[PDB]
């Protein structure tokens, strides 16, 4: 736990547990950043659902519990505006993969937007969990920074 944070990805010389969702690719970039000098670039998307993801440990993010999730995202080109969605990917009690929305924000180019939900409740039957970031309907390259999973209510 922490200053309440369970995880806090700054992107300074490390990707942390972040990986690509779909056939995309994620890597550190110094072209833009919200804090420090780097951020996580997400590119090679061929469908809007592609993006950046991180597995969530059920020992720490108990299903049925409420938690805080936060991230800042931006893009520079490829669209005139986009809708960033921060989400939870999981498998339910029936063995079916579900996608639940944690937060979503629409923004134009060259502008950091804050994806944030201090009170997100994880469905009680969830297993094999992943928090992910995508855009709703484009395949633009985008950047994320300051990725945080924390205690319900944490002010970010
Ligand atoms: Ca950074």
User: Buried b vs exposed e over 81-118: b needs ≥16 C-beta within 10 Å?
Assistant: ebbbbbbbbbeeeeeeeeeeebbbeebeeeebbbbbbb
Asked if 102 and 117 touch (Cβ cutoff 8 Å), the reply is yes
Q: How many angstroms separate the alpha carbon of residue 64 from the centre of ligand 1? A: 31
| CA 93–ligand 1 middle distance (angstroms) | 37
User: How close is the Cα of 39 to the center of ligand 1, in Å?
Assistant: 5
d(CA 40, CA 142): 8
| Dist CA 25 CA 106 (whole Å) | 22
CA distance 24 to 61: 26
Resolution (A): 2.1
Q: How far is the CA of 107 from the centre of ligand 1 (A)?
A: 20
Cα torsion 56, 57, 61, 64 to 10°: value is: 90
What was the structure determination method? X-ray
d(CA 16, CA 7): 9
DSSP state string for the chain: --SSEEEEE--SS--TT-EEESS-EEEEESS--SSSS-EEEEE--SSTT-EEEEE--TTTS-TT-EEEEEEEEE--SSSS-EEEEEEEEEE-TTS-EEEEEEEEEEE-SS--EEEEEEEEEPPTT-EEEEEEEEESS----EEEEEEEEEETT---
Phi and psi torsions of 95, nearest 5°: 85, 15
The torsion angle over the Cα atoms of residues 105, 47, 40 and 85, rounded to 10 degrees, is 20
The whole-angstrom separation of Cα 63 and Cα 88 is 11
* Greatest Cα-to-Cα distance within the chain, rounded to the nearest angstrom: 44
Q: How far apart are CA 72 and CA 68, in angstroms?
A: 14
State the distance from the centre of ligand 1 to the C-alpha of 104, rounded, in angstroms.
21
Sorted by where each starts, the structural domains of the chain and their CATH numbers stand as: 1-156 (2.60.120.260)
CA of 12 to the centre of ligand 1 (A): 6
Q: How far is the CA of 73 from the centre of ligand 1 (A)?
A: 11
CA 13–ligand 1 middle distance (angstroms): 9
Ligand 1 centroid–CA 124 distance in Å is 33
Count of C-beta atoms within a 10 Å radius of residue 64: 10
How far is ligand 1, taken at its centre, from the CA of residue 79, in Å?
A: 23
């Amino acid at each position: 736990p922490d200053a309440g944070y369970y995880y806090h990805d700054t992107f300074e010389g490390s990707v942390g547990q972040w990986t690509a969702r779909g056939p995309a690719e994620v890597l550190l970039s110094g072209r833009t950043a919200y804090k420090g000098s780097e951020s996580l670039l997400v590119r090679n998307r061929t469908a809007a659902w592609n993006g950046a993801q991180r597995a969530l440990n059920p020992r720490t993010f108990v299903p049925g519990n409420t938690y805080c999730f936060s991230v800042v995202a931006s893009f520079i080109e490829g669209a005139s505006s986009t809708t960033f969605c921060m989400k939870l990917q999981y498998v339910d009690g029936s063995g079916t993969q579900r996608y639940d929305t944690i937060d979503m924000k629409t923004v134009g180019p060259n502008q950091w937007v804050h994806l944030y939900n201090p009170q997100y409740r994880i469905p009680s039957d969830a297993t094999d969990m992943y928090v992910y970031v995508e855009t709703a309907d484009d395949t633009i390259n985008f950047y994320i920074d300051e990725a945080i999973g924390a205690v319900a209510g944490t002010v970010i």
